[PDB]
Design a protein around this nucleic acid. Structure first.
Ligand SMILES: [Cl-]
Ligand SMILES: [Mg+2]
Ligand SMILES: [Mg+2]
Ligand SMILES: [Mg+2]
Ligand SMILES: [Mg+2]
Ligand SMILES: [Mg+2]
Ligand SMILES: [Mg+2]
Ligand SMILES: [Mg+2]
Ligand SMILES: [Mg+2]
Ligand SMILES: [Mg+2]
Ligand SMILES: [Mg+2]
Ligand SMILES: [Zn+2]
Ligand SMILES: [Zn+2]
Lengths: 77, 91, 244, 103, 95, 135, 41
RNA sequence: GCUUGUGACGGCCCGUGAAAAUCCACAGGAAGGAAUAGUUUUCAUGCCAGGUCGUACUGAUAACCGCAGCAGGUCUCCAAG
RNA sequence: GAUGGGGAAGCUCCGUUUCAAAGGCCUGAUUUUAUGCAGGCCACCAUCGAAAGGGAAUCCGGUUAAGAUUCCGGAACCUGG
């Protein structure tokens, strides 16, 4: 229900002591004037709100996954 | 062009109610629907609300008046009488 | 016979006044220390229409002498009174339109309205639109004031009774023909259930003293004495004379 | 050509039974009950609407911050700027006039 | 006759019409006489008198409304207050 | 016939300080590159001191006599000139065009103005200036 | 002393709100109080 | 274009077209408050609870009333080419 | 439509803020115990009366032989603390 755009803020939410679950969604969509690319959405389940971070760079996306805390339960697709 | 010869605003009543009664309503309908000068702001923006209530579109001033005119003839005489009597009390 | 129409009105079932949209009772301020010794200043906040009343009403706000608050009064507006005007009420008030003064503090020939029959009853006389009271003389002995009433009668009133300088606004209302039954319907819709009226001669004898007969006619003199009882007083009651 | 129905048991077209037709993610037309529109707060003197004040139902004002319900000025959220300007000028001039009457 | 004196200053002298421009002239000290219509609101009239007191400016009260004052200055619109900057061949200041 | 001088007392009419008395420090009749209108640099009172009776103790008198000042550039049309005067030579040098457009210099000038107002209020003088307007 | 001021109040008609005065002469006493006083009179 | 919502206006009245619970703002300045420390739950996040009764179906040329599975009577919303 | 009061042999009638001593939440005072006791504030002075008037807050998808804006999944919001 809420979207965040700052990656530094995203990491703070993942260790907020009330977050237990998260999911990663992959979307195959097209860009403005080119061939389709890969879009990934990182969703953090808070107590009262769901936070969504969307990044359209696949190279920058893989680094975010490796940086997620291990204690967080992550759901794939 | 001129649309009616003599009925004027009372043409909405058609041929009903009699000519004399329609004539009397014509005189008072024109008075109550007219615009009057505001004695406070000097503009011609005073129109009737309810009977006896006259409000200026500008300057937001409401004045109590006659049923179909801002000032009746009797009210004008009362102002002169009070003014004449007031001048004989202080001096 | 049965109970006639004018007898049924006293029970007050369907003949009560329609008072949903009334702004409130129109009264002067309660006669207090400020009124009877000096004067107090009020301000006209708004002039509004009252359902069932031809004359408009004015809302005037005064400060409470003994408490920190504002007290609002409902006056019957006179000609010339406008929003934002200062109203002065008391024994030592000036002779201006809208001011409230005792009858003994104004000269002869002064035009007043909403006059008290007795000091403190907060206005009883000359309340309808376009009506006023003329002061014709003073009697400093016994503290009495002689006035002329709108009906033409002469009355002796106490000099401590209050009145509002001017004439009730909204005059000339009855000069306009109603011109249709619909306007009469809407007029009494805001007053009471008294319209339309069925003539007595159009009824049956059980319904009215004028009812019956192979022609529509009263059949006896319509001048009824003052001493008649309920059910008989229909027509011209205690008429001194008739005809044009 | 889909036709809708009320979602409450009130079957009459009253002020509290207003509906709007919307299309759901299921691809169908469904009635949506809407609340009565709010009215802007009015000035205490001239009666015109107040600038910079949120328009909400009376009970909803308790759920918003004070910023939405006032203006950073004397009488903010109660009287408009022009009416406040009139009060200040009138207060100053009258008080000055009272001094010259005293002497 | 104020009307004749006021008519002469229009053709030769410098004047200013309107409330906003009059206050500016008094604030700058360029004004020498202000003429106020009869039906001017008292609060505005009281403020103009206070400004003229601070700048030592003479005040004249026109015996007529804003409709009449506009005619006297030869204009087809209502004028609430007139500020006289400098007189020409007229002697309104010395009368 | 010019009264908007460097010591004149006026009343603010708009802008979060309406109804608060102020004293003109530096006037600018012929505008400037910024603020292209007749304007003055003024120092005023945002929080007036509270009334002090004889029953108040030593601690409470000091608390109730605190004054919170402000400095502002105001259009002439938004000021109402008075007939009162207040000398500004004690703080005229600290308030100018330079002290604005800089957050640090605004606070340094305000504390100097605060000290001048507090000393003026003590040994009571200019009583009208320090009295809150009622409206 | 330099901070205190003398501000007398005006208690005339139309002026400031009247202060608290002794209204014992005007007290609407209970019924039993009035009857025993009027019995004496 | 149809249905409906809404905005700024205009016409009409001797007709000018509810009340209360409830919520908010302002004026006011009683009190409480800092230096090795406090206040703000009208900013953000986090914790707990939310009782009782109604809820099926018909709503009419067969589920209502007229002795009935009676051509009568019975308030209202949605409305394609 | 109770009460206070006034009627009526009486069943009961009038009246709804009335010729009434008509009532309780902000605390301070107390660490013997729970609230006695100090100021002030406020006098409005039962209750009933709308499943179409006023009114704090929910949506989508799915699910049964028959239930759902009430169950399931997901996503929100209000009130009180
Ligand atoms: Cl009958
Ligand atoms: Mg017959
Ligand atoms: Mg008979
Ligand atoms: Mg007979
Ligand atoms: Mg409802
Ligand atoms: Mg069902
Ligand atoms: Mg049956
Ligand atoms: Mg039966
Ligand atoms: Mg009863
Ligand atoms: Mg109830
Ligand atoms: Mg079902
Ligand atoms: Zn006007
Ligand atoms: Zn306003």
């Amino acid at each position: 229900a809420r979207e965040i755009t700052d990656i530094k803020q995203f990491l703070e939410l993942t260790r907020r002591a009330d977050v237990k679950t998260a999911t990663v969604k992959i979307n195959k969509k097209l860009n403005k004037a080119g061939k389709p690319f890969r879009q990934t959405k990182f969703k953090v389940r808070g107590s009262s709100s769901l936070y969504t971070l969307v990044i359209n760079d696949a190279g920058k996306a893989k680094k975010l996954i490796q940086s997620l805390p291990p204690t967080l339960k992550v759901n794939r697709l | 062009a001129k649309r009616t010869k003599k009925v004027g605003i009372t043409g909405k009543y058609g041929v009903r109610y009699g000519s004399s009664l329609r004539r009397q309503v014509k005189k008072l309908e024109i008075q109550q629907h007219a615009r009057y000068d505001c004695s406070f702001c000097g503009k011609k923006t005073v129109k009737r609300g309810a009977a006896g209530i006259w409000t200026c579109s500008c300057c937001k001033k409401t004045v109590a008046g006659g049923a179909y005119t801002v000032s009746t003839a009797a009210a004008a005489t009362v102002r002169s009488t009070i003014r004449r009597l007031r001048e004989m009390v202080e001096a | 016979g049965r109970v006639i129409r004018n007898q049924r009105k006293g029970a007050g079932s369907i003949f009560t006044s329609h008072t949903r949209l009334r702004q409130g009772a129109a009264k002067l301020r309660t006669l207090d220390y400020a009124e009877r010794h000096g004067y107090i200043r009020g301000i006209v906040k708004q002039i509004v229409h009252d359902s069932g009343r031809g004359a408009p009403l004015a809302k005037v706000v005064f400060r409470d002498p003994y408490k920190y608050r504002l007290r609002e009064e409902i006056f019957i507006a006179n000609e010339g009174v406008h929003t934002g005007q200062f109203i002065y009420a008391g024994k030592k008030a000036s002779l201006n339109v809208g001011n409230v003064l005792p009858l003994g503090s104004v000269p002869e020939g002064t035009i007043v309205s909403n006059v008290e029959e007795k000091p403190g009853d907060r206005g009883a006389l000359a309340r309808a639109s376009g009506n006023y009271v003329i002061i014709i003389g003073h009697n400093p002995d016994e503290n009495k004031t002689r006035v002329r009433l709108p009906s033409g009668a002469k009355k002796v009133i106490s000099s401590d009774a209050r009145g509002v300088i001017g004439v009730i606004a909204g005059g000339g209302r009855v000069d306009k023909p109603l011109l249709k039954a619909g306007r009469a319907f809407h007029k009494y819709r805001l007053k009471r259930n008294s319209w339309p009226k069925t003539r007595g001669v159009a009824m049956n004898p059980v319904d009215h003293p004028h009812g019956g007969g192979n022609h529509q006619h009263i059949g006896k003199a319509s001048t009824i004495s003052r001493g008649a009882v309920s059910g008989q007083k229909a027509g011209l009651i205690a008429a001194r004379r008739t005809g044009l | 050509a889909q036709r809708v129905t009320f979602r409450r048991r009130n079957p009459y077209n009253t002020r509290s039974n207003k509906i709007k037709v919307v299309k759901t993610p299921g691809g169908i037309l469904r009635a949506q009950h809407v609340k009565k529109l709010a009215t802007r707060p009015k000035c205490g003197d001239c009666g015109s609407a107040l600038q910079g004040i949120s328009t909400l139902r009376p009970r909803q004002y308790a759920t918003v911050s004070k910023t939405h319900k006032t203006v950073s000025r004397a009488y903010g959220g109660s009287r408009c700027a022009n009416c406040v300007k009139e009060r200040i000028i009138r207060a100053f001039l009258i008080e000055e006039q009272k001094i010259v009457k005293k002497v | 006759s104020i009307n004749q004196k006021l008519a002469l200053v229009i053709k030769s002298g410098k004047y200013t019409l309107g409330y906003k421009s009059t206050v500016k002239s008094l604030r700058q000290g360029k004004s020498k006489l202000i003429i106020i219509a009869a039906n001017t609101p008292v609060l505005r009239k009281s403020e103009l008198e206070y400004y003229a007191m601070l700048s030592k400016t003479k005040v004249y009260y026109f015996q007529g409304g804003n409709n009449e004052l506009g005619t006297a200055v030869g204009k087809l619109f209502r004028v609430g207050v007139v500020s006289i900057l400098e007189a020409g061949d007229s002697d309104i200041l010395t009368t | 016939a010019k009264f908007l001088k460097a010591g004149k007392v006026a009343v603010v009419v708009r802008g979060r300080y309406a109804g608060k008395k102020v004293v003109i420090v530096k006037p600018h009749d012929e505008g400037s590159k910024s603020h292209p209108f007749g304007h003055a640099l003024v120092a005023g009172i945002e929080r007036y001191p509270l009334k002090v009776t004889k029953k108040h103790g030593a601690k409470k008198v000091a608390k109730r006599t605190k004054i919170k000042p402000f400095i502002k550039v105001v259009n002439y049309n938004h000021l109402l000139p008075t007939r009162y005067t207040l000398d500004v030579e004690a703080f005229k040098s600290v308030v100018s065009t330079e002290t604005f457009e800089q957050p640090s210099q605004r606070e340094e000038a305000k504390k100097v103005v605060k000290k001048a107002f507090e000393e003026r209020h003590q040994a009571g003088k200019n009583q009208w200036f320090f009295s809150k307007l009622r409206f | 002393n330099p901070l205190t001021h003398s501000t007398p109040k005006n208690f005339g008609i139309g002026q400031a709100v009247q202060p608290k005065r002794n209204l014992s002469r005007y007290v609407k006493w209970p019924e039993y109080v009035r009857v025993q006083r009027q019995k004496k009179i």
